[PDB]
Amino acid sequence: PRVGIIMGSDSDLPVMKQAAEILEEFGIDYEITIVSAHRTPDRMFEYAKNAEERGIEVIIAGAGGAAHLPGMVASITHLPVIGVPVKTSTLNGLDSLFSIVQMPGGVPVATVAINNAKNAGILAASILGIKYPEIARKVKEYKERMKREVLEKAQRLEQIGYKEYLNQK
Amino acid sequence: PRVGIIMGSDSDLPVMKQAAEILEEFGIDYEITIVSAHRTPDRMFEYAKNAEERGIEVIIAGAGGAAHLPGMVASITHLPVIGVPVKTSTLNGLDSLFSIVQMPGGVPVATVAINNAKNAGILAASILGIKYPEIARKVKEYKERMKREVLEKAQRLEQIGYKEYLNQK
Amino acid sequence: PRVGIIMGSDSDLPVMKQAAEILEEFGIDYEITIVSAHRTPDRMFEYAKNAEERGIEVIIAGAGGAAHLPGMVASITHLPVIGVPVKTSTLNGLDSLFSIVQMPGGVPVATVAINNAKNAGILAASILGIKYPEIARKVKEYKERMKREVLEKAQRLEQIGYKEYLNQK
Amino acid sequence: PRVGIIMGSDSDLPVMKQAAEILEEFGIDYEITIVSAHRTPDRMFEYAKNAEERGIEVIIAGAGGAAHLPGMVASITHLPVIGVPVKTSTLNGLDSLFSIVQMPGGVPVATVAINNAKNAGILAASILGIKYPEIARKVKEYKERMKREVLEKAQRLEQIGYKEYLNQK
Amino acid sequence: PRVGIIMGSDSDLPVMKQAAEILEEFGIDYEITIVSAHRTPDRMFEYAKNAEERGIEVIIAGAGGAAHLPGMVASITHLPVIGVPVKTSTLNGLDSLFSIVQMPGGVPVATVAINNAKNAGILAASILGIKYPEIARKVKEYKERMKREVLEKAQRLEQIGYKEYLNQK
Amino acid sequence: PRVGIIMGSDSDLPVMKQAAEILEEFGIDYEITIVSAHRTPDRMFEYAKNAEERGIEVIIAGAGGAAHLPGMVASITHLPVIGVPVKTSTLNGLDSLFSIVQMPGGVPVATVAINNAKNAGILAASILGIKYPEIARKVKEYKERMKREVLEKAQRLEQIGYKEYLNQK
Amino acid sequence: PRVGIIMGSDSDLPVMKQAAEILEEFGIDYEITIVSAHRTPDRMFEYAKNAEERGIEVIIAGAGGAAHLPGMVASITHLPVIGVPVKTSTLNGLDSLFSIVQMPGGVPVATVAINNAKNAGILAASILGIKYPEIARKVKEYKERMKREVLEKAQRLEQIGYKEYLNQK
Amino acid sequence: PRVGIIMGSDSDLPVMKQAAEILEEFGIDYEITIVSAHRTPDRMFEYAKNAEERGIEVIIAGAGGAAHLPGMVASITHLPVIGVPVKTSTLNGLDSLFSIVQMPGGVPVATVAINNAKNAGILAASILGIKYPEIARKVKEYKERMKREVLEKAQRLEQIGYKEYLNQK
Lengths: 169, 169, 169, 169, 169, 169, 169, 169
Description:
Eight copies of one chain form a homooctamer.
Chain A: E1 2-7, H1 13-25, E2 29-34, H2 41-50, E3 58-64, H3 69-76, E4 81-86, H4 94-101, E5 110-111, H5 117-129, H6 133-168
Parallel strand pairs in A: 1-2, 1-3, 3-4, 4-5
């Protein structure tokens, strides 16, 4: 099981590392690299064409602004492509979101929330989990952990009250 | 291989049938039914909890307005959930899109374009294709067909010119 | 008279405490806890189903992003549910607002301004006030106080002038 | 139990009648009239001031564009005020929504979806239901009916299939 | 010649003082005070009704969020009312702008840019200038000064170059 | 007393005639013509420069899309300029509104609602009314008529009910 | 002198033909064909790479939704690329506009108005006109014609009045 | 070969200097100065009219808010005009973008991304490059450099990993 995590700019790396961190938590092997739709277009084409042959099963692609990388990758490969819209300073990622999610009929990108590379990681795991029972188990376990974590927070708030909860937060 | 296609309202069925049509084109088995997050919440919970056990591997969920169904389904199941934002008369589906795509960290929905259930179908196939080589082949073949279809249109436009192309279109 | 104040994340607590503070000012009893639509969905269902039986008469629910908690609570309980859209870093709470206010026909949420949990508190009091004359009196008195406070500010500005008013502000 | 339904323009009546229809379904007494914030401001002031004394317990107010009526009513009365943003031809009710929902601290309006006067009716009933057990029962029963109605639609879709469902729809 | 400058909150005073400063530059007499549409509605009504009798000829009104003050003032008085939309932390004044500029037919507010109370001052002067030739002259002179100021900046940039211009800026 | 009504395109005339109709109702003399910022820029400059000398006291300017005409006119003349944003097919006049209302410091345009040339007419009258007591009286009388008209509608709705009101509407 | 006009879908041809019509009016030679970024990506790459060698000097590219074609073409060729955002049914071309205009640093697209292929034609001519004096003359002449056309309309409106102008329009 | 870089305010100079820097990198001669559409309108007219005669072949114009400068320049000159929308504090440059890009039919502005004067510089070079082979070569070389730079970053990320890449970044 392997995921490719790509982004156009190393300015995107603070956000996109979040997908790597989740995948590491799940024990899922990945590569993370730079592929610019606009500055290295041939490299993008080659990456998308060859990903399947190299054992990549899901691609997570991040891009900001006029964010073409996920969609262009999905136009080339038959693999599932997940798009992370990266927040822009001007339009707060709305440009990124529309550029990725609004793919015309024929070529989908699986779009997640602006700046939410953690969720692109979890979605990649959920996709992998239909094929790899071990990964399905890891996702189930993750969801139970998240539940337990909220239950503990709720219990604490109910026990110490908002004033004290905030003073310690 | 099985996909569940759900929607909250039969008003969503004109759009959501597009996912069924694609899946039929690919020979992928599916069920299509109504599950309302807001009017049948227990039914939604039960659907999401039991989908895996029944052999469903991907869920495609459509919702308009304050569109909670995809996200609530994804909160319950570990399966990949694809969200189709259905166009609203007031805000043209922008409310639908934000309600689906902006899932907080922990629980992803794979969001596609407003009203683009055809793309939710194709994405479901691409996801299935990592497990089922026959389906991967069908997606590859679909992409080659789409290519050939554009090449034929381009050739025709270049041969008869825009005036005549439009007169016959 | 009792109000339930819920939120999905303890990150929402700085905002949501504002509803608690108002209710305390009015002498209205409340509980405040964490209930995550997406990470503890069963807990949400159970909270909404049982609130009436426990004497809760109004629920104030806060959520950010794809903000499903108020709407899902309102789908389950017949009690009035007030939704506080919590500001997001990316879309400044616009995603939150659309996710809450745009509830389809059948299931309303009483939506107030982005990040305005103080107003969810006051609205809960106004609702309670139709049943509890003491609370109606407290709301009337609050409105008279707010009036008197503005009158004093106006008098001061007119007496010392904007320059000095700002220098002391 | 009594609800006041007001709107600034008789152009709003096609939408606002939806609240009257729901209230009639629930057996809740109401008045429906025209009160223009901008063309009859004294009338608005007088309506808001005197509503409580006349036995009105909830006000439903509709307005489009720069939609001030709900908020101005809520500034005057201590009663709960529900705001229906009416769709505008230019901005599709976004102007209406912001004008109503974004009330500053101190004065809430309970805002529902653009053009959704049906939901303002149901919310008024849910509010009344905390005081009047008969009304609480009517809301519970309404929610069970909505559930049963979706279950029947789902069963039908599963039995006759989407093609036939749409042909009869 | 007299202008009334009003605002709902002393939080608006940093912005609204800009109108006072311009008027002072033009030698135009004004009053500046607090009038809250939502917290002192009777005071607002009284202010608008009596402004003409007191010699006020133009009203400049600032408001943020669900910004009703300019429009409500204009509903009551026949005097020209200029609306300053004050920037909100959540929606950056877009809510303010729609609440003010989108007045339905019958009752106009003269709307200027978000947070641009300086321009409300200049517009008030331009309005006064049709009646008071001295004020018309002051506005003409202001426009010539603004021109001369830009010409001097342009000459400087052309003489010292952008690097040095920025180093001194 | 004289108002100049200008627009860039005769496509704007259906909307802009509304200002002429109001002015005619008030007995205010006006001219209405075409002045294109983008196709006849010299004509625009000349119109703005000479309006005062010809006895024009207020200019009403309409423009759609990148709507520069009001702002450019206001940059040249010291007279008050009122901007009507004309609705566009693509962005429903939002582009028009931002292009007009967001004038930087120094040069105001009095902006009214998208497509609301009727309100530009009334605002022009309110402005004229500070100088011409006869016009002030006409505006006062107009506001009383609008009030009486709403009172009659309200009485009718209360007398015949919504069903019948709508059947006759 | 030669311009390439490309679009991803023959659904874009009604809009994009407008650029061809202008170019024909100016006597500028062009080709018009279909090149889909998403369905024929290799064809797009090849088109962009080879355009210069074939004598193309400006490319006009139209795309709707997640509109990647102009930007991807500009990433490959050093030629000036003009982007026409094509209106979408859901978001009225706002998605198209952001996808095209918001190109990150390094790779520009010359973006014109949503659906305004006529302006992409004129811009292509203005660009060509710096090299070809005959084309510069044609653009100058076009601007003089547009001026004369507005002057004639203005004269007519002033002569027959708005009522009659509209009756004949 | 010569480019004119203009802006309305010296507040725009931090952004607009980016176009100068690129042009300097390409060895392209330019002038940079202040031309205010709204404060020096005659100067704007004169600049646009005379640019061709002075050897200017492309104009780059920056403006914020109601950003009329690019469009007004393009209305006057037959030269290609590139518009840089400058970010505003309130609406983050969305007002700027709509004011520039949404030019009606007849008069185009070549619009680039909000605050992206670097791209206006590169576009000016691409335009110049159709006439000046030396400049075409410089743009080709720039694109190859950008490619090589991304390839080196990608290699580094793949060699040292994201943790270390970020620690050194």
